[PDB]
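Teaching assistant here, posting this on the class forum so everyone can see the example we discussed in section. The complex has four components, and the goal was to see what a joint structure prediction looks like when all of them are supplied at once.
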Amino acid sequence: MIDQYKHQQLRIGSVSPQQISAWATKILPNGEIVGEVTKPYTFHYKTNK
Amino acid sequence: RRELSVGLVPLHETFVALVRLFGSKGRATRGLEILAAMEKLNYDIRKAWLVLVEELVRSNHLEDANKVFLKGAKGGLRATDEIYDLMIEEDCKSGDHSNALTIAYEMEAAGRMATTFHFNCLLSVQA
Amino acid sequence: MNLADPDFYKIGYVRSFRAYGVEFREGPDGFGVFASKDIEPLRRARMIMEIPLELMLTISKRLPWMFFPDIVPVGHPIFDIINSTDPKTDWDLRLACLLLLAFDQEDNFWQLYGDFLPSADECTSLLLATEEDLLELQDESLELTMREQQHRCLEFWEKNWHSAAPLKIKRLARDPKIFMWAASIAQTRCINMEMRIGALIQDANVLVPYADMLNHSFQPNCFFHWRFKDRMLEVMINPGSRIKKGEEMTVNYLSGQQNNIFMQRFGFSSAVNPWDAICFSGDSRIHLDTFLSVFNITGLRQEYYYNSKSAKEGDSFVDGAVIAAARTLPTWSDRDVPIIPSVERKAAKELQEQCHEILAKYPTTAKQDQQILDATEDGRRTLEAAIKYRLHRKLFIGKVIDALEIYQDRILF
Amino acid sequence: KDVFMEAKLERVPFLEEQMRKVNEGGGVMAGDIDRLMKSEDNRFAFVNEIAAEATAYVNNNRDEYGHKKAIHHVLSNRMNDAGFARPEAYLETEPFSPGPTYLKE
């Protein structure tokens, strides 16, 4: 009686900086990356945008 | 072609002879064409499908052999134990675990219980 | 075909036995199980003949011996008789001891069920026949085996009933002809099955009241099943099988083994015997894919079929003899894809004519001939039964010859 | 010979009222489920087989279920092949109801 094999997995480990960059950086067609999030601008003092 | 034109019902040996040739040469869909005939002439396809499956392995039509056996054995079609040993070993010889495992699962559905020989064949490619 | 007495269904019915669409008959034969009403085709199975475990004997098939409806008391001096019995050879002896014990212990169910069982004057088993009646049989190997088997039970009667015989052990068999009745009953009505009682899967030889009445036919329509939870044996109607309003419902005794020398040993005689034939030799070989082709017999020896959707009722000449002699004969096949050589000088005619010479109308001894059939004399319930066996073997040989000559005549349409 | 033939077989009367309260309380289904499970080895496999058969029933003839409770349908189908009349889908009626709804205690 061959049983219904079911192989699942769950790994965990520290990420390389390249992995984070590939996670977050989005390159526009113009060539800009701009994934750094330079300024700490939470929400405009103006309209909540 | 003249057998149906005249109206005489062909013999059991008649269909048996042709399917042996088509399997020997590698005819994939041609064998199924005859298989429909006995499905209308009140003739069982078990012997014809057994020899057709076995002949396709006697030539290097491994992909054809799995397709014909799986289609016929998906429904109710008991197979001789010799065929089960042949395809499980042959599929594992060329690295066809996906086809071999399905046949082994199909074999156990029809009563026959997998022994150490079948597990040994599977372990060859899983290793 | 008259129904059985009302007491037959009861006594067992009071002990939780339920039969739904059957009614046992009383006419002179094995009581017989014939149905009523119609069932129509079904999907999986229809359960019938609910038989509990308490109404059994079920001695185990291997050491140690255990009886789940406990009959032998603790320390009773009859377990020593059984434990001294040779295993794997004579399972019908300890079973006979259990049957004899279930006749004088208490108001046990078998104390009442004994009356419906066939008596010494009844029964067909050869263990109750005599010397000249065994001699009245066109067979010497069977004669030797049955003469030895009438012994080996005389021997296992004086080893445990010899002038010491505690009254418990005595009074069970005061003479060596009721022990023969018990031995014959054990031989005829024992069945070996698997019994899952609790966490124990075991193989055992069992005796089943109300189920042995199911007569025999090599074309069966009944299964034996053992319900694991409530410990009940049940007969099951086959899936996709229509049932008439009083026709026979049968369960096969032996399958995959026959030759009419062991079935006959176990009772009556073969009628169609789909697994027996006579060795031919004498010739070179006959073709294989024409004997099953003229009658449209399906191959695959383990499972032979006739395909009733054959022709415009081509013939009414198919039987167990045809399906048996279609696979026990030379049957040359060669490459299995030949030209089918219609060389009637070699592939047909003379070769089977040689078989006609080999079967030279009973050439072995021919102790008797057509005169024997229907001598019109019934007596002792064991005579006219060896005669019946001779009749059926002669009929099988004759019909095999007839089928062979029909085949050799019809090779051209 | 044994004098208990009819003393243990006399029919108990007054059973007609103890035939109905089984039928609206779900007693017939409860006593049929165990008889269907009397031969099964693993109950989970039996439950999964019943669920798959009910799924097939819903797929093949969709536009009937919503009232019939196809699980009840497959249970009745399995119980109806060995006698055991068991009306279709164990459907309950209101023989005496010139009104829309019972109070239900």
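For the discussion questions: The longest helix of chain A spans residues 17-24. Helices of chain A lie at 17-24. Think about how each of these relates to the inputs above.
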